[PDB]
Amino acid sequence: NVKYNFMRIIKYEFILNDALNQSIIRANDQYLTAAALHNLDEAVKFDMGAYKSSKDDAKITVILRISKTQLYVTAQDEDQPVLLKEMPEIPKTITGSETNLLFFWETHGTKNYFTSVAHPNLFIATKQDYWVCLAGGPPSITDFQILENQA
DNA sequence: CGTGAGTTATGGGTTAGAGTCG
Ligand SMILES: [Mg+2]
Ligand SMILES: [Mg+2]
Ligand SMILES: [Mg+2]
Ligand SMILES: [Mg+2]
Ligand code: NA
């Protein structure tokens, strides 16, 4: 059906801050969480890879990688934590169930939203005292600020 | 450093137009 093809990395080493000034950080080895940080060196740094679709998608599709690693952000289902998936190289071709690696990246001003290609009404979301999850919206926080050049 | 008339559209350059590329 729909196929996604990797173009290139379009953003290196950025930080995601939610609307509450909380940065995404590593929770353990599997998950991410969010926390208010004084020192942004504890914040995860991300790379963003752009994909084209085989059809005229409305919003650009991206993959999110933890910078200087082989760990890619992967969606599960609603209210479940995103998973860090280890991969030898960035996937050149994505279709079928592997679209859980991909997100539509939309901006509303300075606000950035990442919706699962596998679940287009679910967002990367932070929730107090819990891991970064897929969520439909409030009370979860779904709008992020992108802090660039944070290597 | 990235193709080949496509999703040609774009937040963007990748957007022209078959020819560079090592
Ligand atoms: Mg998580
Ligand atoms: Mg494609
Ligand atoms: Mg997804
Ligand atoms: Mg989001
Ligand atoms: Na489009």
Numbering used by the authors: 9 to 159
Per the authors:
As a member of the β-trefoil protein family, IL-1α adopts a secondary structure that is composed almost entirely of β-strands with one α-helix. The core of the structure is a six-stranded β-barrel and another six β-strands form three hairpins that serve as the bottom of the barrel. Unlike the other two IL-1 family cytokines, IL-1β and IL-1Ra, which contain 12 β-strands, IL-1α has an additional β-strand at the N-terminus that forms hydrogen bonds with strand S5 and the long loop L8-9, respectively, further stabilizing the whole protein structure.
The IL-1α/SL1067 model presented here represents the first complete high-resolution structure of IL-1α, making it possible to now visualize the location and conformation of all protein side chains. The vase-shaped molecule looks like a ladder that is bent in the middle and it contains three major parts: stem, turn and loop regions. The turn region of SL1067 contains three distinct motifs: a U–A=U base triple, a G-quadruplex and an A=A base pair. The dG4–dG19–dG17–dG6 quadruplex is unprecedented, in that it adopts an “N” shape that is composed of diverse non-Watson–Crick base pairings. The interface between SL1067 and its target protein IL-1α involves an extensive network of hydrophobic interactions and, in contrast to other modified aptamer complexes, a large number of polar contacts. Another characteristic of the IL-1α/SL1067 recognition interface is the protrusion of nucleobase dG11 from the SL1067 loop region. This conformation enables dG11 to insert within a small hydrophobic pocket formed by Lys67, Ile68, and Trp113, making a cation–π interaction with the aromatic side chain of Trp113. An unusual attribute of the IL-1α/SL1067 interface is a complicated hydrogen bonding network that contains well-ordered water molecules surrounding a monovalent cation.
